[PDB]
Ligand SMILES: C[C@@]1(C(=O)Nc2cncc3ccccc23)C(=O)Nc2ccc(Cl)cc21
């Protein structure tokens with residue numbers, strides 16, 4: 001029993017974190033093979049700023065050992081520093097771009113030194129509600145699938161509302177954001193409906209059935225209610241994805257949708273679901289199956 | 298900005314997790330130097346669980362009965378001793394990935410990260426607090442025994458918990474790494490219940506200071522309270538008595554925000570009386586009690 005916001009073990013990623021210094025700016029780098037990936041704003045027209053830099057201007061540090069930079073290129077908003085030493089601790093990895101609603105683990109780092117690990121979700125507005133201070137830039141988001149680390153996020157900036165914006169590891173931002181000091185705002189956020197439903201199934205699995213009802217709804221009627229409560233549209237793909245949880249608990253997806261419709265119109269009424277007074281939307285249907293079945297890495 | 302339930306990076310601990318098999322029972326072990334620490338109930342046969350005599354069960358076991366596995370490599374057990382409710386298996390190989398470590402016993406209200414493992418393989422990491430009733434509200438399935446709780450302050454890993462059992466309410470009970478249980482619990486299948494839980498008042502106040510630091514002041518008020526009057530109200534909501542030690546511990550947060558501890562205590566009393574009124578504090582509709590005053594300073598400043 002128990003349901004917790006659980007991150008993937010960060011060990012495979014810790015072995016990659018390095019400190020990248022360029023002039024006054026100090027942030028984190030991801031050292032994979034002989035390349036160190038970091039936000040391109042470490043140099044701060046990035047093509048013009050980078051052409052003025054030499055390899056010895058980038059001081060890379062892995063523990064107490066300094067890596068010597070032998071090349072530098074830019075791929076969208078990420079700087080790829082070619083180094084002389086290939087990281088022996090480089091895990092099996094892939095660079096994946098995640099979709100909003102998908103969750104990942106963030107290894108927050110300051111001065112190439114991992115300080116904490118937390119779970120979060122790519123919000124529908126392409127921001128993440130992270131926990132970052134100055135020096136956290138270059139901190140990465142990842143998932144582990146068997147023995148392979150899928151890098152999906154690299155932290156770049158904090159928006160004025162306290163939410164965070166970053167890129168995939170190919171330097172492509174999530175959202176309509178740019179990497180410079182300018183007026184940028186996080187768009188109106190929405191709740192990840194498929195994730196709330198997954199968390200309601202986890203609650204059922206954990207012996208919390210008060211919110212269940214004899215009712216079931218149509219996908220059209222659920223989406224009409226969901227749009228009114230700033231909830232993401234639930235697709236037939238989402239219903240199919242919730243299939244295993246629906247099978248395991250005995251509550252059809254549209255039965256749990258009638259439960260969510262009642263929770264949205266009526267509220268929790270002094271009650272909690274999995275120790276929460278709010279509808280949690282940062283557990284995907286896969287996170288619920290992984291935690292309520294015990295998959296290992 | 299941002300406030301998250303943040304666990305310590307688990308890497309230093311992952312390198313220690315091993316699978317301990319003794320007969321039918323398979324659980325996790327913590328391999329530090331040439332010793333593998335695991336719950337002593339690994340020697341029990343379920344029908345030797347209501348009233349196990351571990352000294353009698355262990356005297357019957359030999360070193361080759363304990364199959365220890367670190368990855369695909371099998372460790373050879375060369376000795377075995379028992380220290381309270383933990384089994385210490387002396388192995389022939391010292392773990393090269395052994396970090397700088399200490400065994401620390403924690404007090405209720407203290408938090409720690411848990412690296413949940415199954416078959417000596419880490420599956421997840423989460424942040425926990427030792428509840429005032431000495432249980433933890435973990436996320437554990439069968440086969441998670443031996444999973445450890447830790448804090449990684451500086452470069453040293455302080456091991457504070459080893460998972461042993463799940464109580465009938467779904468909460469978990471375990472020991473420090475010296476095998477001493479937290480709480481009035483025993484490693485027996487006998488009827489054991491978690492005592493009435495309470496809210497860690499010092500941690501709620503710390504989380505309210507984190508909220509002030511993050512620009513959330515809606516809950517603040519023009520009132521102060523005596524410490525006695527705060528506890529009289531707090532006790533009625535099942536909140537732990539706030540001691541002068543707790544007030545002293547909150548001193549730095551009070552200094553940083555400019556809100557005296559007893560004024561933050563008046564805000565808390567008001568939140569207990571009124572609730573949130575559709576509002577949230579740091580994305581929560583409930584008063585969070587699993588962030589110590591130290592966790593708040595670490596996450597908000599360094
Ligand atoms: C092995 C066991 C235990 O609580 N294990 C578990 C530990 N943690 C989580 C579990 C979730 C589901 C099932 C079993 C879980 C048990 O089933 N009875 C019993 C009695 C005494 C002790 Cl010290 C240990 C146990």
Ligand SMILES: [Cl-]
Nearest residue numbers: 402403404407
């Ligand atoms: Cl303590």
